[model samples]
Target: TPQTTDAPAFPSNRSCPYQLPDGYAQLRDTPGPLHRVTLYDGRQAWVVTKHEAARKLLGDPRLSSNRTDDNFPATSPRFEAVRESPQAFIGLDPPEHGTRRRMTISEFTVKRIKGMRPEVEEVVHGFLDEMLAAGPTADLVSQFALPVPSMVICRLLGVPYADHEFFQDASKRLVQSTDAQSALTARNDLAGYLDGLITQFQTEPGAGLVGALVADQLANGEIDREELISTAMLLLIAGHETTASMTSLSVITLLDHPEQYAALRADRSLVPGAVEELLRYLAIADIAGGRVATADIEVEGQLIRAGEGVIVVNSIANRDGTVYEDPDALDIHRSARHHLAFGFGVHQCLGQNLARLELEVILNALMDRVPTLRLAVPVEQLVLRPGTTIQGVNELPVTWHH
Candidate 1:
């Protein structure tokens, strides 16, 4: 029989479970690949602890992503309420998920992100300029990490980057807010903001994904205001948050290891590989991949019966000893080629390519422009972000002159 433990339940600080035997450590280090566990709601769910089971189970349709189901296991009360809110395709399955996802997929494809690269390059430099203007010392998370994606997503969604303060507050409130009421209020705040832009996308046909979708779905009369509002909100929040978190974490990670930082600067060719390596090492997503088993299915000898919740913890999978040699160490030089940092299967991250480009451009630009940048404060001194699905810090303070 698979073991049961309440220790590794939901809504905790995230570290790469693949890297340590602590802080959600049991997510991977459990004796069995799958185990029965209790969540905050006093509900039981299957938490898959290994990579092979995660891939096989997450991709399987028998495991449904729809949280509205009574049987769906929610990590917390706020997560439970998310099902009540207007979510994009993330909360749906099958034809609905595929249909909505296709509407925006074209925007995030490799070609589109590549086309957007030069402008993104410009965005990267503008932040570097701001950092230099504000610092010999600066909060990398506030000045660079947060803004890089804020600007990109702003351009992509046709929301003005100057309006970041409002959205940033709303986003933080929504992502990491303590309770459902605050979450709902924050959702309404962001929804209203995006709803306003979407209304503009109607006549303007502006250059970004929002305009593109407005032209496609709303314009063709295939969808309603609720559909547009929900999807855009998810994209807007998720669009910037995860990558922003990763950028800050990556910088802090790289800065902690100056040799890898030097290696990245030493060879731009290492940028792409380094990005992949960092994505693997950081594993910044908290729980972007959890689902309820809709039908009974046997995975790795454990039968996850219908309606049982399961967290397909990707970070655990990324640390599989069989796949990665010396997985715990932050070997930015190593090729952690198969890490599921972005997840797997149909729900694979839509904005991954754009995120990859944004990370590559900014980190490369930082290395080239500010080679001596080092932490103003030790990594331990930094504050981690609270009350959000994304794993990241509150700010990353650093200096370049010394």
Candidate 2:
């Protein structure tokens, strides 16, 4: 016999583009911080809906982020392929996770990413320059949001920008594929391509993050070729996709809320806070930080037993009323730096600083360059990316004037 409760299903569909699913509000208000829910694969897992509990649980060492853990709940059938292979540090546990994570930390340090500001500004304006030249209307996603991160990451990884289409298509299939075989094939093909590049880095290390790792870490035998391949694959997908989602989503959100937009434009000082608020508000990577318990742990007066999966719903946790005043409304002035838009604990987003830098540069540039930017199509016409871990619109059509 299987144990079951009247617990709600996990990943309730979003009824609004910029909001968490309406079902989440009820769950958040539910008396207990932890609620059991059926996941996509019919496995029951705990959903951490409150802010405090999520921080506490995710911070605890007893929980595991490794996707290969037998108890780890699969969000979808496609992830079967992901679990079959070695994962990057994001999906690994401590010790190995920490050591590997530190290797890349220097590249994303606040000082280093701040140094990238001018280059990021250059990238933003160049795309905007082309967009403005082309016409009055454009798909902000393909034309701006997608390419901005793509080019930045390409430059950072020493991956040629000319190869963007191939990697982007492969990454898309890896994320969006619904079937295991196709997802696995996409993963294998992408890894094979990156492996060949790593081979080149072995002979003559180029001047990018990959090259630095190749010259230092790989050369020193701190990490092996397989690990390097997986690491590159992780960085390629993560470095671009989420930032792309955040950029486009932030643009649409700000344009939708004109008052917020006006205040932001009136004072450029608001850009940093505005970016944080947008990250907190959108929290687009809904399932970015799922975990499994390796040992029994008491959370919010409930025992999450070993091997049971847990999902700290950052989306609803960011909206926890206790944490923020008027948690649902978008306010540029609010200090929202504490939100778990980046997951908490050791595995919090590695590229958050870079992501924030890109957002600030892009948003500020957009405001200065295209003051008349407005959505070209009604919100209803925009389609959300399907069956993907990241949440975002497929295309953001916008029109602007000089």
Candidate 3:
């Protein structure tokens, strides 16, 4: 249950983006699954700290991901801009969200994931080949982490890999941009680029995602132009961004913990569990996006009045002491399928299966091919992403012997 009156504030600071604060334990020790906490912006909201509570609340029809709502909570200046013009269906509720999601879900279905596996493997290996050709010393992020997914998504969307420089550059700037106006402008520019791509797809009945969407829904007039643009932008940015970030961080996390690293290398069968475990352990997203309570909701007897905002902190829930024993320790063998890393309910990440497939394929390929691969620098040396929404590295410098 979420506390309403006299609920305390959330911890304003943390030692590192990867580590959830120790003070969070206090919230868990409380009577219910939620705590009334204050965000850095000084706006108070319900922070869902328990795992069960989050799953129930996320799927509840009373909550809204709509950014335009007057009571919608904005945690920071970066998100304030994102709230201005929501690009992805992940941010919308009910009919609009369902409409866009259905329009785009065809390509990301399970069969679609299987269909893309070979291409994923080919693209992954191509990037690895390029990395090996370049030299032993290279930034894994720039060479490998970012490019594999970027290339894959580009091909799927019918966007040329040659133009990746333009889209990727804009994406990097907008995601980490602290300046509200600058962030908004960067997102707008990304939408513009996709708008052009949409126009091109509209003319031809092509095979890629953008092309398919254009032919299937756009052609039939089931959805309008703006919806097409938003769906394209959502997939383009989110499709690559999360998986890329995970790759860089995953390598480092494995290297840092030797016994676990050795275990992964010892058994190839650990691939499936390893990927889910890492996603849960890292669960980089701090604030589980935005959720505004539309009607009064109750769980475990606490009252949440209508029009209240709630921030479901997945990182905190994933590390719950009661739910997952020794939650902080990294164990590649851990059963983590229940984790909320991909989120829960209708908005659960659209590309999760693809992300999992890419990770499993790339991780096995990278580890098996380059058995001696190791981090080129200390963990502290890596540059972390700045914004609160996503967690990743700016540059993950690594090396291995020739």
**Per-model TM-score on C-alpha atoms:** 0.93, 0.96, 0.92
Task: Flag the better candidate by TM-score, 2 or 3.
Answer: 2
Which residue pairs in candidate 3 collide? Answer: 9-38
Sort the candidates on lDDT, descending order: 2, 3, 1
Q: Higher-lDDT candidate among 1 and 2? A: 2
Instruction: Summarize candidate 2's per-residue lDDT along 273-324 as a digit string, tens digits.
Output: 9999999998887667589999999865799999999888888889988888
**Candidate 1 worst ten-residue window by lDDT:** 14-23
Worst-scoring 10-residue span by lDDT in model 2: 380-389
lDDT of 2 at 151: 92
- Model 1, stretches more than 4 Å misplaced? 1-7, 14-23, 203-205, 386-388
Best by TM-score: 2
Which runs of model 3 end up more than 4 angstroms from their true locations? 1-18, 23-31, 79-87
Query: How many pairs of residues collide in each model?
Result: 3, 0, 1
Per-residue lDDT of 400 in model 3 = 80
Summarize candidate 1's per-residue lDDT along 52-101 as a digit string, tens digits. 77778878999898878887776655655555565589888997899888
